[PDB]
Amino acid sequence: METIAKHRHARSSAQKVRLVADLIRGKKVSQALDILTYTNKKAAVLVKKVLESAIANAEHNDGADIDDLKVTKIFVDEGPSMKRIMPRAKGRADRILKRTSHITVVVSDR
Amino acid sequence: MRLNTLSPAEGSKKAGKRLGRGIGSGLGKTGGRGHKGQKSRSGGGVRR
């Protein structure tokens, strides 16, 4: 029916990745791949690798034809944050959150 | 006459007051001590 790929614990805030996921939600995969190729965002590289993996999964594991595939579902979830310390002035310390995301792409011919 | 059929006499076992447990109990918040002053304090009161 549908085929999935994910990139869990990707190094980017979900807010940043969602800007890219929104460009391709619902598109034919060939058009999605073109959009990502010409999107100048680091998140576009991340998402394009997940989409390519989902297309390979669909053809190898599920016997799908790539020309019929669409990005039927795509969403980004918040992963764990890495906590770091940033020295500020006057002996004060701040917490830094290095946020991560789980990227999920679903492709299907229906 | 079994260990689960014995009851105390009526009136022999009044439950104790439990202060500071909510409005409905009638002893919430200040627990009957009123507002402020030496007699509301922990350890408060004057000698005999």
Partner: protein, 103 residues
């Protein structure tokens, strides 16, 4: 044809075959109840107005059910005064089916 009558301290305008929810009546389910004080009977253009009751006017009904209505929460709360109280309520009713109206 419809008729107006009093029951449970309220008034009701009814036609044959309608089901009316009234305040509780002390009548067993399945019994027939008579409302002999009819305030008005209207059949087409013929209108009889009670002054206060229509002479000989009678409404026949059948007691269909007794029950308790939807629950209502009573909340009392006096802000800043350490006072709150809550109460539940379900009101009794008797449903009756209008079987006859006679002028």
């Amino acid at each position: 044809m419809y008729a107006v009558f009093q029951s449970g301290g309220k008034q009701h305008r009814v036609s044959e075959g309608q089901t009316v929810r009234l305040e509780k009546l002390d009548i067993a389910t399945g019994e027939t109840v008579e409302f002999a004080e009819v305030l008005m009977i209207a059949n087409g253009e013929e209108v009889k107005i009670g002054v206060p009751f229509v002479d000989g006017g009678v409404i026949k009904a059948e007691v269909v059910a007794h029950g308790r209505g939807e629950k209502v929460k009573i909340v009392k709360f006096r802000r800043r005064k350490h006072y709150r109280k809550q109460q539940g309520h379900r009101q009794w009713f008797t449903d009756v089916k209008i079987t006859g109206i006679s002028a």
